[PDB]
């Protein structure tokens, strides 16, 4: 019992693993159509909206009355967590693309058809660090807030976006579960 057409999805049999490159048919299916999921990034106003959401968050948290350090740390953590949830958590497309063709890539890896260090990727890398530098001037006298904020930033907003973590899946038993490699 051997299949004439092998289109079967494997799972990671290790702890640290990489998603396997695609074959000829898979590449053709991916390149047949412009990806409707990761093309809005390059259009008019995307960078500006990334700027504006931060200002809105700042005004909201300032409305909650609390001291500058608390408002700024809340702004930083909220933006970083939201960006991670939107761009790095869910893999696939929210609509039927093809035979599926992107069932094991997140939205971050889909940008600019997997071309690294493009201007947009550079901008989205720069934003977290400058946001940390701006907020650094207010809770600088508290070791706990400073350390926690720096940890959250460097570990959630700069590491997943690095060029060495591309197509990197970490699969532990009891939490993440078996990842998808083929």
């Amino acid at each position: 019992s051997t299949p004439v057409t092998d289109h079967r999805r494997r799972r990671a049999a290790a702890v640290i693993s990489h998603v396997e490159q695609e074959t000829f048919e898979d590449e053709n299916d991916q390149q047949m159509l412009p990806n409707m999921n990761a093309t809005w990034v390059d259009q008019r106003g995307a960078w500006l909206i990334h700027i504006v959401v931060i200002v809105l968050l700042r005004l909201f948290y300032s409305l909650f009355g609390s001291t500058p350090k608390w408002t700024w740390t809340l702004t930083n953590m909220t933006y970083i967590i939201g960006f991670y949830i939107m761009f790095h958590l869910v893999k696939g497309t929210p609509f039927d693309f093809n035979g599926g063709a992107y069932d094991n890539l997140t939205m971050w890896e889909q940008i600019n058809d997997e071309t690294l260090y493009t201007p947009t990727r550079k901008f989205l890398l720069i934003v977290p660090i400058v946001l940390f530098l701006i907020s650094n001037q207010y809770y600088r006298n508290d070791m706990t807030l400073f350390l926690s904020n720096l940890a959250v930033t460097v570990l959630i907003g700069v590491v997943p976006k690095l060029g060495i973590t591309h197509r990197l899946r970490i699969s532990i038993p009891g939490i993440t579960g078996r990842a998808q490699i083929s």
Partner: peptide, 14 residues
């Protein structure tokens, strides 16, 4: 160390 961290961050930005 604060100026040190900020300088490191500027370097990594570049």
């Amino acid at each position: 160390g604060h100026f040190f961290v900020e300088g490191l961050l500027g370097v990594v930005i570049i």
